[PDB]
Amino acid sequence: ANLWDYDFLQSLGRHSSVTEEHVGLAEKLKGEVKSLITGPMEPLAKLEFIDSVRRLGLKYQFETEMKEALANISKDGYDSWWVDNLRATALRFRLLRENGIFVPQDVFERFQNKETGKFKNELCEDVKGLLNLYEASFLGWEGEDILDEARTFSTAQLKNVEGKISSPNLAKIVHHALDLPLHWRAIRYEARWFIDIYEDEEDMNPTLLKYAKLDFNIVQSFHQAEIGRLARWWVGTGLDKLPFARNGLIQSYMYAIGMLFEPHLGEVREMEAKVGALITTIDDVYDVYGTMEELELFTDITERWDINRVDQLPRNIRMPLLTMFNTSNDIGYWALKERGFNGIPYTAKVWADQLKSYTKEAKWFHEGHKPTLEEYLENALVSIGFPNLLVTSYLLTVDNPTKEKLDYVDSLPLFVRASCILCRIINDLGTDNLKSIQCYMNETGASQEVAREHIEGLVRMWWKRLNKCLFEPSPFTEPFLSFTINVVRGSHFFYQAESWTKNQGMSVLIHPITL
Numbered sequence: 264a265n266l267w268d269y270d271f272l273q274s275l276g277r278h279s280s281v282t283e284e285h286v287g288l289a290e291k292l293k294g295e296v297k298s299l300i301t302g303p304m305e306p307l308a309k310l311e312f313i314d315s316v317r318r319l320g321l322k323y324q325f326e327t328e329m330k331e332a333l334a335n336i337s338k339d340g341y342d343s344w345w346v347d348n349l350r351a352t353a354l355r356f357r358l359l360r361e362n363g364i365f366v367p368q369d370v371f372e373r374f375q376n377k378e379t380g381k382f383k384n385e386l387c388e389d390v391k392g393l394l395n396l397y398e399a400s401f402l403g404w405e406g407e408d409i410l411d412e413a414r415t416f417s418t419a420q421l422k423n424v425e426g427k428i429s430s431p432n433l434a435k436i437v438h439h440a441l442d443l444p445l446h447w448r449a450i451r452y453e454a455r456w457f458i459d460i461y462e463d464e465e466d467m468n469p470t471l472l473k474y475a476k477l478d479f480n481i482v483q484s485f486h487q488a489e490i491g492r493l494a495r496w497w498v499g500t501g502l503d504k505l506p507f508a509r510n511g512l513i514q515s516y517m518y519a520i521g522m523l524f525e526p527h528l529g530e531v532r533e534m535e536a537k538v539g540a541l542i543t544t545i546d547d548v549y550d551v552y553g554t555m556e557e558l559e560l561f562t563d564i565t566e567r568w569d570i571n572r573v574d575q576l577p578r579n580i581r582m583p584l585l586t587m588f589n590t591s592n593d594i595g596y597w598a599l600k601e602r603g604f605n606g607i608p609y610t611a612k613v614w615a616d617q618l619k620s621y622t623k624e625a626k627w628f629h630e631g632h633k634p635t636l637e638e639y640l641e642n643a644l645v646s647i648g649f650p651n652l653l654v655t656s657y658l659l660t661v662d663n664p665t666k667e668k669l670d671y672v673d674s675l676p677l678f679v680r681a682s683c684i685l686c687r688i689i690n691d692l693g694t695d696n697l698k699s700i701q702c703y704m705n706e707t708g709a710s711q712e713v714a715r716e717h718i719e720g721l722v723r724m725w726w727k728r729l730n731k732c733l734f735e736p737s738p739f740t741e742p743f744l745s746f747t748i749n750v751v752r753g754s755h756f757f758y759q760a761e762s763w764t765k766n767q768g769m770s771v772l773i774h775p776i777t778l
């Protein structure tokens with residue numbers, strides 16, 4: 264049991280402690296959870312149950328029932344159960360907005376002083392109210408000034424009352440929230456954390472908890488089989504023996520699990536994990552290893568999709584190039600075989616764009632250029648690799664793929680571009696004139712502190728644009744809508760170190776939950 268050892272990883276999938284007993288039991292428990300979601304409950308208890316299902320990582324199992332239950336609740340007429348109750352108002356606001364039912368920000372106006380616009384100090388003691396208002400504030404859109412205030416008020420008040428909480432479970436939950444709000448957390452990682460928290464909750468439903476543990480283990484069995492296949496592939500490429508990208512395959516796979524964890528998306532997840540491993544490896548080629556002539560040739564070969572000159576590159580560069588080429592061809596071919604559409608033009612194109620973006624960064628560094636923040640981000644939203652990963656994910660999943668459809672996604676419309684910019688700025692915040700904070704410092708003369716606060720403000724702004732894009736009609740469908748949001752959550756989760764990562768990998772991918 265070592266997450267960084269390829270002998271161990273290549274053995275995964277061979278055995279699993281998940282039995283067909285476990286699977287029949289999961290089918291019976293699923294039917295009872297489904298019935299609990301659709302069945303009688305008081306509305307606040309129903310909101311709390313639905314929120315728990317999501318946090319345990321099970322929305323993917325009960326999407327239709329959860330939407331059906333919230334739709335019934337939203338069209339009630341009776342509102343005494345929530346009106347004048349901050350906790351209930353805030354939970355309802357968030358769950359309805361998460362599930363495509365609009366609630367206006369003015370539901371919070373009654374909790375503000377009419378003269379200052381400030382939240383009332385009498386709320387400064389209601390911990391679960393404050394917590395629900397904090398988590399709700401992240402579902403806000405641009406110009407929803409009450410929700411911007413709700414965030415700053417609830418953050419300040421929670422920081423002040425965290426140490427006054429009596430319930431150890433509630434204290435842990437509030438600490439967790441102040442680190443990252445639930446809206447920004449990666450689903451699969453939050454599910455493993457929350458299974459242990461939920462077990463200790465007063466209101467805990469034992470049927471739901473048992474289902475959550477069983478489903479967690481069943482899903483984890485698919486992940487172990489994928490890791491096995493990917494580790495055997497990676498060792499096959501020989502890139503594991505290369506002087507750089509230490510732990511690139513398993514780091515990529517852990518990122519991919521943030522993007523998409525469901526078993527039915529296993530083949531797509533494996534291909535996203537391959538691309539991510541290659542991105543990390545080639546990033547090091549362009550950053551540390553290659554000479555400018557080597558990198559110009561790598562870029563030209565990729566732009567032309569023409570490997571005639573590849574033997575001019577040294578072995579440690581030639582092997583990443585040809586693995587990128589071969590895997591891009593394999594992924595485009597999977598689209599032809601499985602989806603009826605040859606994807607090679609699109610995998611080749613996004614790799615050429617990505618290497619051009621690396622080449623521009625390398626030229627800026629070589630020539631001592633200081634780009635503006637805007638000039639930097641225009642290139643760095645491509646260099647982060649998410650146009651590559653997201654266009655690929657759309658290629659593999661869209662119904663009735665066409666050149667028109669792939670050309671639109673590849674043009675990075677606002678919804679997609681917002682996700683790519685977020686992933687770049689979150690990475691950059693997770694730590695040189697070529698990173699977000701330093702560019703803004705060069706452009707404005709701001710301090711590190713002030714430049715960091717500006718870039719944090721850009722994270723909040725681009726989230727508000729994503730949030731609103733999801734209430735708008737879209738040419739996109741599931742699962743691509745979810746991928747776009749979930750790559751950002753993956754970025755937040757991994758850019759908040761080697762023991763923390765290993766713990767996440769071992770607890771989510773390697774060790775089953777004890778039943």
Ligand SMILES: C=C1CC[C@@]2(C(C)C)C[C@@H]12
Binds near residue numbers: 515648649
């Ligand atoms: C630069 C990045 C951000 C995305 C990435 C992951 C998939 C390992 C390739 C690395």
